[PDB]
Write a protein that binds this ligand. Structure first.
Ligand SMILES: N[C@@H](CCC(=O)N[C@@H](CSCc1ccccc1)C(=O)NCC(=O)O)C(=O)O
Ligand SMILES: N[C@@H](CCC(=O)N[C@@H](CSCc1ccccc1)C(=O)NCC(=O)O)C(=O)O
Ligand SMILES: [Zn+2]
Ligand SMILES: [Zn+2]
Lengths: 176, 176
């Protein structure tokens, strides 16, 4: 089963000039508790909160995290919004007010029926050292680096249970 | 409800030096039919298929799409893998062999119970012109630019039903 390389390529088209400056800006994930999520993404993963937006009428907040230098964040409101929303590879955490209190509430990580979304993935210089630190910090693992067939690739979970793949681009070909 | 800016910031920690070179590399989505998905992401959205991997024993293929110049793709196998997996903001489409044939099968987009993942988002220079073209191409819309309270922001669906937010960073502050 599955397509051949030629079959896959025949389904691909060259980029229309009108799509020249498009960029993959964000991946939105709903989070039960923004306090737990902000701590995990900044302290554990090293991301930076680059923008926060609240919509009181709709009762939700958006938290934008990205691997950006805190010093690059514009000081001016409107200028910070356009900068934050033009960064690529950001995480848009959606907090629906009140979920933190609802003990029965939780979001679906997409890895059990019904499936869809799978995970976000972070490229790191060293999977082993990165995971050693994650263990020290008490991070939950779905797959430790040397568990299973694929060694040197890990999967951790965020506070909501979303999977995060930990990989080293420079050692992927070695397993594949 | 919701955190205050100060409350949010107090939950954030500075990036540990060990996370210095981490980068948000991918968002994985499962696709029923890679032929429909590859056409949509390349022809409609302008992305480039930068890497394809097949795992016959496990019966699945991975398709990596990113807004990269086709000419930057390394020619050498192992060199292309490390380059593709070190690009940030890529989409990792997972094709489980056989889903295209199963008429009853479909993936969950996360926007109906049980919710979790919400959408990926593309920053474009002009939401209106981008959407005019999408309409011509017969793309399904969840929200046209001027529908609803938030004007100038759109949501389209991919072949699997995943939502894709279309936004112009330079006009977001105007609505917010
Ligand atoms: N309850 C919502 C909260 C988030 C939400 O509603 N987001 C808006 C968009 S948030 C607007 C926005 C986007 C980028 C930057 C600033 C503001 C949305 O997805 N609307 C879908 C629709 O209109 O059908 C949820 O859980 O998804
Ligand atoms: N049937 C799977 C197919 C995809 C899959 O199994 N992917 C592997 C990883 S694919 C390995 C890989 C990653 C990056 C680059 C090349 C290969 C995975 O997520 N494993 C989870 C676990 O071990 O518990 C699905 O639908 O999720
Ligand atoms: Zn969004
Ligand atoms: Zn992955």
């Amino acid at each position: 089963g599955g397509l051949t390389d030629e079959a896959a390529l025949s389904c691909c088209s060259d980029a229309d000039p009108s799509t020249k400056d498009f960029l993959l800006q964000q991946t939105m994930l709903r989070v039960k508790d923004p306090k737990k999520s902000l701590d995990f993404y900044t302290r554990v993963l090293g991301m930076t909160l680059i923008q926060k937006c609240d919509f009181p009428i709709m009762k939700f907040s958006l938290y934008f995290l990205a691997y950006e230098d805190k010093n690059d964040i514009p000081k001016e409101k409107d200028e910070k919004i356009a900068w934050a929303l033009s960064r690529k590879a950001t995480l848009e955490l959606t907090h629906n007010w009140g979920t933190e209190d609802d003990e029965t509430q939780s979001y679906h990580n997409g890895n059990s029926d019904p499936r869809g979304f799978g995970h976000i993935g972070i490229a790191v210089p060293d999977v082993y050292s990165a995971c050693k630190r994650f263990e020290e910090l008490g991070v939950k693992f779905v797959k430790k680096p040397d568990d299973g067939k694929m060694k040197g690739l890990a999967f951790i979970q965020d506070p909501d249970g979303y999977w995060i793949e930990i990989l080293n681009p420079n050692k992927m070909a070695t397993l594949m």
